[PDB]
């Protein structure tokens, strides 16, 4: 059925973290991760004398951190005041009089021209005129996206229920408060409160998200970083990108790892426990996922669902009945507008082939896997095709920002 | 009392197709074909010619047709005299002018056997040549393998013929002959089949001891036979001390990982395949294992059923068991002289001190771990302090070595 239930609960790793053998390879892995640290601080505070600890990279990253910090709350106090009077006047005069669409045709209009002039144009005209850092910038455009599916989802799942005449009002603020930092997009009224917040336990899973931050900081800093140094001196043509290219796998599968654990488990359990959201169905065990139709199972639930549910079943309503092909087409066109639109406007780049041949080599590695080959060989050769082919295109989109489109 | 076999297929074979830890298997295989590509290519790049060649490998088989005719003198010798001893042995007695003259010259003979051509013949021919340490290595693995079966096929077959009419059976050579193959040392005629041997699994086996053989060689030689040289050349003072342990800990539990996988699980069950063996339960769950004093988890079955079953049961029996664990200090020392003989034979080195400091080390990570303390702080600090305990004894031995005995 359409719409959003509650059945699933926890994590998916905390599930598995405690059953016996999964959680003795989890802290033997936490035991390699420490020891690593340890290793390179001692071995190379012994050998040099400085102890180095370089915190060149996100200095300059954030760089305008107030002006980030500024629009984050004029954007927050937009997206929590004007949709939420906007559509409260009108849905309370809405069939009193205006027998034709002419009401609904101005008032939405309005909406649109809200959402692509306010909140379309000022986070991307705030962050374009003082030429603003990719970190801080990529910031703004996140919660800018954030925001647009929070503005959109609060409008289109109260739409319908009006129209369908008695006339279902907006909901109280006190919980349009709680839905604007909900670990979701899809708006519900309905939040099961869990029993009580621990506070040891927020504490600890924001002790873990700022760990894995500076972890994942630390050997950016120095495994990524001298990578970044001698891609930058001679960029060119070398056939010698090679041999980083060929040197920056397994640093970018540990970034990998810890990115997905620190964001999408460590924050936004550490949140759903201070608002007691109940779901925390925050991602799906994406390593088994086999190929995009029917059986994708998704390593971010929540930006699939919103995908799904108001791109796709609005685009098969329209399009056709049985172009159901030219109805995911349309949802990857959409994906991939939205996402070249973010990486290009973050990175001070127009490339757009990034996101349609990650979509060719998922293509690839899908059907090498489901034409019914369990085989351990065309798995292990899944895997190792998929972390190469993401370095290879990665330092490939590197270079040709770096070199070729920084030189004329 | 007795042990007799029910289980099956290691433990290896039944988690690695539960399918989170199968997937955990499958992008640790790819990462490590990764990265011995990636370093292949980048020292390709760096320096010229690829960097393997295979030098110290023909430095530690040296020997190996020497190896290869005592390994043959070994196998016929106590294929032969053993067995000859103990069917001479058998068909007449209790028919003696004075009961126990019989069994004291038969018993005699039999040690001066194990003492004489078992325990003098293979460690003579190893220090007479002053053989390799690799090749040695096979030598006393292949003379204590010997040794153990002997002592255990007349342990097994003595008690049943003196206790009294048909009181004393004793087996076939044809059965011996499968005995001195089989994964054990307990010695027993109770084997069952599996239905046939499998041709592609062995094959598969074989293949997989060979590359996993290959891959720890490259791994030893690369990432800690620089780090070999340098601690041979200036070992005295803390610099390069301090250096190697903080840089001996990931290649270290690497090479143990593979080099455990390579023998306990793949040489152990390719043999256990082509002989038709059914009980693969080769190794417990060491990663869970607790304490000492019961419930104890060994890493290899084999050896601690010899020790316990072939020398704690008799020192019950020789100390009444008001002082049994007293008595059993000297379960503990028999492990110690044998461990002690085989590693001091095995690299010219006397340092007593090695396996009764591992001992303390594994009490120290059992107090540290159980009392069933259970906290994943407490049992993450005891893999850390059993990756960097590892780590840091294998180069203090491996530096006591290199200086104390090459220098005075
Ligand atoms: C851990 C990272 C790994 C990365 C490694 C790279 C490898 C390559 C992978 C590429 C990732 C790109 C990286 C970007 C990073 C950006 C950062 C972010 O966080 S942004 C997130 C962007 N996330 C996506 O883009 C999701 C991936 N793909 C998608 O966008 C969608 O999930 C999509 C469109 C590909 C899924 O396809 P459907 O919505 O289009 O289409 P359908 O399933 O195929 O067709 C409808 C049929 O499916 C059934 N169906 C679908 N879902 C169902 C459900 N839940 N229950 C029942 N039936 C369902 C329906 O019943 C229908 O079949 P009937 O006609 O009824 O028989
Ligand atoms: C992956 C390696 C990582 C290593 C990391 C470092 C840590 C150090 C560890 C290890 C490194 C060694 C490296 C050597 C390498 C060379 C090559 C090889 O393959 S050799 C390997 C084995 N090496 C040994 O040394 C033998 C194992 N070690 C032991 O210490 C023994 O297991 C030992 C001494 C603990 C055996 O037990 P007890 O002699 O303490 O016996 P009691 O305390 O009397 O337990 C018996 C009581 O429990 C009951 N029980 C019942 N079922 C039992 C059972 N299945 N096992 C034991 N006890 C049982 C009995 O009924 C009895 O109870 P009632 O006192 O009479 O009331």
Redesign the interface.
């Known amino acids: 059925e359409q719409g959003k239930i509650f059945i699933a609960r926890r994590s998916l790793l905390d599930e598995?973290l405690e059953v016996?053998?999964?959680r003795?390879?989890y802290?033997?892995f936490?035991?390699?991760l420490?020891?690593?640290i340890?290793?390179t601080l001692?071995?190379d505070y012994?050998?040099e004398g400085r102890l180095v600890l370089e915190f060149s990279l996100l200095s300059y990253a954030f760089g305008k951190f107030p002006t980030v910090v500024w629009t984050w709350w004029i954007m927050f106090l937009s997206t929590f005041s004007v949709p939420y009077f906007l559509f409260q006047h009108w849905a309370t005069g809405y069939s009193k009089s205006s027998h034709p669409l002419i009401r609904s045709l101005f008032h939405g209009f309005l909406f649109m021209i809200f959402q692509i002039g306010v909140l379309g144009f000022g986070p991307t005209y705030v962050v374009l005129a003082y030429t603003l850092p990719p970190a801080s910038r990529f910031i703004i455009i996140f919660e800018q996206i954030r925001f647009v599916m929070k503005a959109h989802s609060f409008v289109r799942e109260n739409v319908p229920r009006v129209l369908n005449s008695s006339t279902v009002p907006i909901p109280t603020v006190n919980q349009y408060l709680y839905f604007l930092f909900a670990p979701t997009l899809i708006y519900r009224d309905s939040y099961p409160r869990n029993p009580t917040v621990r506070w040891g336990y927020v504490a600890m899973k924001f002790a873990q998200v700022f760990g894995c931050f500076f972890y994942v900081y630390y050997i950016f800093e120095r495994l990524c970083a001298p990578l970044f140094r001698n891609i930058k001196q001679e960029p060119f043509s070398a056939r010698?990108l090679?041999?980083c290219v060929?040197?920056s796998?397994?640093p970018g599968?540990l970034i990998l790892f810890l990115t997905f654990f620190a964001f999408l488990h460590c924050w936004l359990n550490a949140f759903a426990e201070m608002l007691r959201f109940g779901d925390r169905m925050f991602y799906k065990?994406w390593?088994?996922s086999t190929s995009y139709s029917n059986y994708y199972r998704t390593w971010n639930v929540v930006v699939h669902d919103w995908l799904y549910y108001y791109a796709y079943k609005d685009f098969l309503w329209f399009f056709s009945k049985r172009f159901k092909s030219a109805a995911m087409l349309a949802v990857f066109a959409v994906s991939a507008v939205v996402h070249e639109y973010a990486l290009a406007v973050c990175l001070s780049f127009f490339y757009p082939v990034l996101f349609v041949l990650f979509m060719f080599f998922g293509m690839a590695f899908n059907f090498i896997v489901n034409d019914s080959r369990k085989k351990?060989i065309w798995?292990?050769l899944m895997?190792?095709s998929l972390?190469?082919g993401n370095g290879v295109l990665l330092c490939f989109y590197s270079q040709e920002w770096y070199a070729r489109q920084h030189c004329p």
């Open positions: 598995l016996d053998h999964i003795t390879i802290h033997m936490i035991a390699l420490i020891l690593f340890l290793s001692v071995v012994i050998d010698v090679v041999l060929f040197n796998i397994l599968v065990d390593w088994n351990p798995n292990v895997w190792t972390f190469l």
